[PDB]
Amino acid sequence: MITSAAGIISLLDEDEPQLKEFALHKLNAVVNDFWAEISESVDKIEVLYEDEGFRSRQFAALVASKVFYHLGAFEESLNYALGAGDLFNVNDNSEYVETIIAKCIDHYTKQCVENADLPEGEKKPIDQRLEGIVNKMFQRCLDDHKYKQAIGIALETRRLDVFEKTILESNDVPGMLAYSLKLCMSLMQNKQFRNKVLRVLVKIYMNLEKPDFINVCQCLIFLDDPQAVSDILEKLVKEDNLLMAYQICFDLYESASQQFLSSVIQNLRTPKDQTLKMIKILSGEMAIELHLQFLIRNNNTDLMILKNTKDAVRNSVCHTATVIANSFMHCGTTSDQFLRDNLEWLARATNWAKFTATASLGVIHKGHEKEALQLMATYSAYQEGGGLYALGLIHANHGGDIIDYLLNQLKNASNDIVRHGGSLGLGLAAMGTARQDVYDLLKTNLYQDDAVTGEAAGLALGLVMLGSKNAQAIEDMVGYAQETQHEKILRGLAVGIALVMYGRMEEADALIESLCRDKDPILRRSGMYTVAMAYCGSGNNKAIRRLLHVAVSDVNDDVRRAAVESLGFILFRTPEQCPSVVSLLSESYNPHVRYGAAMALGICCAGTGNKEAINLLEPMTNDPVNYVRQGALIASALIMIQQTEITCPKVNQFRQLYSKVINDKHDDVMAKFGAILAQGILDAGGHNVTISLQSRTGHTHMPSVVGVLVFTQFWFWFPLSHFLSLAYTPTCVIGLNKDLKMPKVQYKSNCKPSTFAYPAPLEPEPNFQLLDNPARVMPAQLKVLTMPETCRYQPFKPLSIGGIIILKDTSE
Amino acid sequence: HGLKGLNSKLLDIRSYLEKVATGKLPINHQIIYQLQDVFNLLPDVSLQEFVKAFYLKTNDQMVVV
Amino acid sequence: GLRQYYLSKIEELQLIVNDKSQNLRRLQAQRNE
Amino acid sequence: DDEFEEFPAHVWEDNWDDDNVEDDFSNQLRAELEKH
Amino acid sequence: DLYSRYKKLQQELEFLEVQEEYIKDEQKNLKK
Amino acid sequence: KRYKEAQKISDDLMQKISTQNRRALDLVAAKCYYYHARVYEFLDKLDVVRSFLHARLRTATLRHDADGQATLLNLLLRNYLHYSLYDQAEKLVSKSVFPEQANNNEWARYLYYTGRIKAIQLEYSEARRTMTNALRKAPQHTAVGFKQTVHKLLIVVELLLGEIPDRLQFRQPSLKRSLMPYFLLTQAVRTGNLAKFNQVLDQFGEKFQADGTYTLIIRLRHNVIKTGVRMISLSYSRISLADIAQKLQLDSPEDAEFIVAKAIRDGVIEASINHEKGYVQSKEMIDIYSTREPQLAFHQRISFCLDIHNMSVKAMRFPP
Secondary structure (H helix, E strand, O other): OOOOOHHHHHHHOOOOHHHHHHHHHHHHHOHHHHHHHHHHOHHHHHHHHHOOOOOOHHHHHHHHHHHHHHHOOOOHHHHHHHHOOOOOOOOOOOHHHHHHHHHHHHHHHHHHHHHHHOOOOOOOOOOHHHHHHHHHHHHHHHHHOOHHHHHHHHHHHOOHHHHHHHHHOOOOHHHHHHHHHHHHHHOOOOHHHHHHHHHHHHHHHHOOOOOOHHHHHHHHHHOOOHHHHHHHHHHHHHHOOHHHHHHHHHHHHHHOOHHHHHHHHHHHHOOHHHHHHHHHHHHOOOOOHHHHHHHHHOOOOOHHHHHHHHHHOOOHHHHHHHHHHHHHHHOOOOOOOHHHHOHHHHHOOOOOOHHHHHHHHHHHOOOOHHHOOOHHHOOOHHHHHHHHHHHHHHOOOOOOOHHHHHHHHHHOOOOHHHHHHHHHHHHHHOOOOOOHHHHHHHHHHHHOOOHHHHHHHHHHHHHHHOOOOOHHHHHHHHHHHHHOOOHHHHHHHHHHHHHHOOOOOOOOHHHHHHHHOOOOHHHHHHHHHHHHHHOOOOOOHHHHHHHHHHHHHOOOHHHHHHHHHHHHHHOOOOOOOHHHHHHHHHOOOOHHHHHHHHHHHHHHOOOOOOHHHHHHHHHHOOOOOHHHHHHHHHHHHHHHOOOOOOOOOOHHHHHHHHHHHHOOOOOOHHHHHHHHHHHHHHOOHHHOEEOOOEEOOOEEOHHHHHHHHHHHOOOOOHHHHHHHHHHOEEOEEOEEOOOOOOOOOEEEEOOOOOOOOOOOOOOOOOOOEEEEOOEEOOOHHHHOEEOOOOOOEEEOOOHHHOOOEEEEEOOO | OHHHHHHHHHHHHHHHHHHHHHOOOOOOHHHHHHHHHHHHHOOOOOOOOHHHHHHHHHHHHHHHO | OHHHHHHHHHHHHHHHHHHHHHHHHHHHHHHHO | OOOOOOOOOOOOOOOHHHOOOOOOOHHHHHHHHHHO | OHHHHHHHHHHHHHHHHHHHHHHHHHHHHHHO | OOOOHHHHHHHHHHHHHHHOOOOOHHHHHHHHHHHHHHHHHHHOOOOHHHHHHHHHHHHHHHOOOOHHHHHHHHHHHHHHHHOOOHHHHHHHHHHOOOOOOOOHHHHHHHHHHHHHHHHHOOOHHHHHHHHHHHHHHOOOOOOHHHHHHHHHHHHHHHHHHOOOOOOHHHHOHHHHHHHHHHHHHHHHHHHOOHHHHHHHHHHHHHHHHHHOOHHHHHHHHHHHHHHHHHHHHHOOOOOEHHHHHHHOOOOOOOHHHHHHHHHHHHOOOOEEEEOOOOEEEEOOOOOOOOOOHHHHHHHHHHHHHHHHHHHHHHHOOOOO
16 A cells, blocks of 8 residues: 655655645554654654644544554553543553553553542642543543442542442432442541541432432441531431431441540530430440340250260360350350259369359350349359459440449459459440550559459450540550560550550551560550451451461461451451461461461451361361360351351261261360350350351451450450450340330241251241241341331331341331 | 771771870881881782783682682 | 443453463472472 | 465585685695795 | 453552562571 | 465454453464465565555553564564565664563574574674574474575574584584585685686576575675684794785785784784784783682673572462
8 A cells, every 4th residue: 555654755855835734644544554654753753743823632632542542652652642631532442441441540540549648749740631531531431320339430530529420320329329328438548538438428418309318327337436426316316206316226236336436425415305215225235135035035955965065075175165165055045954953063173163164154145234233143252353253254245333333342342353343344334445444454463563453454454445545544564564574464564555546547557566576475466456456357458468478477376366366356358268378277287376367268258158168177176286276176166156057067077077076085175165156156045146257237346356365365265255245245225215115026038947047956848937026047048038018117228237126117 | 897897997907096196005116017018018009910810810719700 | 331341341451360370380389399 | 383485485514614614734835835 | 340450460469479479588587 | 275265364364363362362362473475475576565564563562461572573674585685674673672581482583583684783702702692592393494595694603703603513314405505615725726716606696696696695705714813823923924924915014014903903813013023922811710800700601590599489380
């Protein structure tokens, strides 16, 4: 064909404009092949473009951009495409246009993020024309109706304006809002940008005919801002939307933090009956009595297996093992069988066994606030301290006047054991609720240097000041740790310093680096646990980098184990992720490394019943080491919590394995201990409760996380294992009416009542099941759950959400 | 580590020299003698024989590697 | 159109994931060995 | 694995020693001695 | 949808890089 | 041999591949491109191939394919060469970056192309090194036609530069038939007798053009004297200008001065000249070992070996 552009390019040199424009046109026509020669002769085309007197600025820029595209520059090509003005076509959907649009998009997103952080400085020119191309693509995509894609590109660019415009002028605002909420909760990383998008979404929600104040308050909780939720609630009160307010308050109690709830409480305190009901609900009073009655009316517990265990029990080790397992079985139930029956068998245990027995009693009567200070009228120094500890567990996270009473007693404590127990109990009672007087009493007891009292002091300090990160107390604890010579107190301070600073996801680099470069192995462990508490559920790749590197390179096996367990805590919001790392680890040299891998898997799949996790646990159990098998057992039980055979076809295998090991000879005492705790786990709480770190709202549960961590910290002190009462999450749904009582109405599951029935105590099959307002509803066995065709009461909140639902009632 | 040690030592000697130059302590002709002995002992690299030998033997080292 | 651009992006990212994951597989073999 | 179809188609090792010269020496030495 | 999977791919590719460095460091420690 | 339905079917396949944007499809795409190009070449049209090929090459560069990129580059280069678009192709190659991870076959083709380019473009040293590398990387078992072509081009470029290429190639079994005329040529030049040189050109011009050489034949018409002076320099240190002139039969012993000076320009020989008494001083060779360049060569090869080791340990495969 033309075979050479030499003639045309040489002709373009001439001043004659008409000639110049026609040469430009023909060059644009034949650019695709002779881009090389055009490259050689760009200079003159650059002159032609830049000298704006010539009325072919756009064409010159377009041809130059195409040429530089063919070359591969892709940057000066981009600028020339930008300078082509509007002459560039966008709907031609050619390769060149498409790729230049891609380059525009990515470059613009880069400057967007750059400025995104930059407070005001830099404010790159963002060539308003580049803004023009991105906007044009926005409208083209809107025309094609790619609302998802418009929304996401807006998010990436940070263009909240375009995001809101597309979502509002989408095809279905509610579904779009749900999708955006999911993306914000999961994929978004930058805290500030995430909060901005949350605010925009909240405003969009408010801008609805019937604003979904559920989502509004959920996003507000993610945003902190108790004032906004308080004002919304007061406005709803004026609106008389009592049911809507009830549902919002229950969601708030389930998800938000005590500080947030208290702020909102005082803001509201700033008709009166409705206000009082809101206040009571937000405090959660009777919001636990509901669960209490729920378990009482559903306390399916096969105590025959525990009779088998107590026949198999010989050593005091397994004696306490079974005590703990029975406490787990019963969970928060007023009914106690062994304690009121096997009195002599209880007496057979003493020393650091009376303490754990009384603690088990507390766990069993969990939450029974009504007779507290009179229930303990039933039950030496060990039993006295255990009574204090059990009272604390009863008031676990519920800080009534029992905090003051425990403060008074611990002050009037004249024994190391009494001091330790009262310290534990008061720390539990005031967990999170950093109170200066309580912190002071703990500081005094801690300074009364003593291993017994010191461990409890450290734990209680961490609990009390949890997530509240007072640099004062931080330095105090670090100094006392570095100066006191009692490895026991040192462990207590390790857990305390990890706990104190639960929040502050990223605001931990200083202290974390200090601890991780510290001297003592116990303080390195403290640092790893502090990282866990800081980055709970964040999936922060930097945090995991640190944790795996240390867990693999450190010289102390204890801290290696702790670090892997921290990895486990961090990766829970992405269960599928953890298996790979925990596998490569679990198959380790260092048996503590293998144990840590097992426990990390347990944390990862707590309440989830993963299949691959059990696939990986089974080879571990039956390992040539004692504690490794113990951990394998406990992790498997944790995973299979509240699971059946059909849902997970290995629960039988592992239950039989537990039974065999307990009724075996040549396994180790601690192996039986692990098996007993595994049974207690699996069938904990009338087999009606589960363990999930994050609330049903996808919201991390601080009490659950702290409970699981402390429990995992039993290697060095058995009495701590009772903390799983905290993580015990009632697996129930309650339909509550405006009268604040259960209405005698039934729920229905459109599924086989064979895949989700209680385990068999030790019509072929329908696809329907029925239940009552107190409803054991497992996570997987919650989505399918539905209210029957018609009833007096209807679910004001979607039932597939789960949890506690308010029921709008018909005429009567 | 050896480089770090040498650097620290020469930092020390420089500090002492500064003290003497400021007159914070008396001149020690012996310590001087030693210092100018050191400097007198410093080598010459751009000697055009040293360099040829250096290249030659570096060539042998690289050959074996 | 947009779908074309993001389809490309996914294509390159998936190529990278492929090669890096198989490298990870080799390293896992080494480590387990 | 490939063939480049596009491109179609005294037992010892010696250099250009051929060099089309006469008797290596006989003539050379005879003439040289005659001159010398 | 498409961007959900795109960002998931981002996450997992990054995490896989993290796996690479994990295994290299651990291989060194295991040689030691 | 039915290249009407065949070309249409190939075009249909090309539509399929263009539509189908799957990575793994890359290699099959490259082969399809090769074969479509071959059939169109047999049809003796190309051109449409140039355009479509070019579009595909840009596509396969935008998507980071290597084997396809190199293959298509080779095809398009050969297309330019067939119609003798040498200078345009020169710009193309200079402005286009060849991929490193390309098959021995592709590198061999690309190196041959670049070698012919630069040889015509009067860069003989690059011609030699590149084509020698191409021949080294080419398979030995087969591809006799490719071997013959590469040998012919290397022979001519080396002869122009002065080096008389070894007799090993001429005695190679699969080459002597294809190279009689080149052997006659090398004999003629080494003799330095334009009579037999030009009569050899007369007898074997037809195949000479058939390969495409006459330009290079005239380049030799020149470099005969260059090679003569090269060997003269190699066999002397202080020879006289008049002596070299009479040795080369170059009348008017100042033409000899100019010739040797041009040789110095080119770099064929390294010798100063002093017209004051009329003599050429060969540059005194230096102990290169007493330098850094041996270190440089060894560093290059060290990097080479370490890279090979690293890529192998990458290539390790392990079952699950």
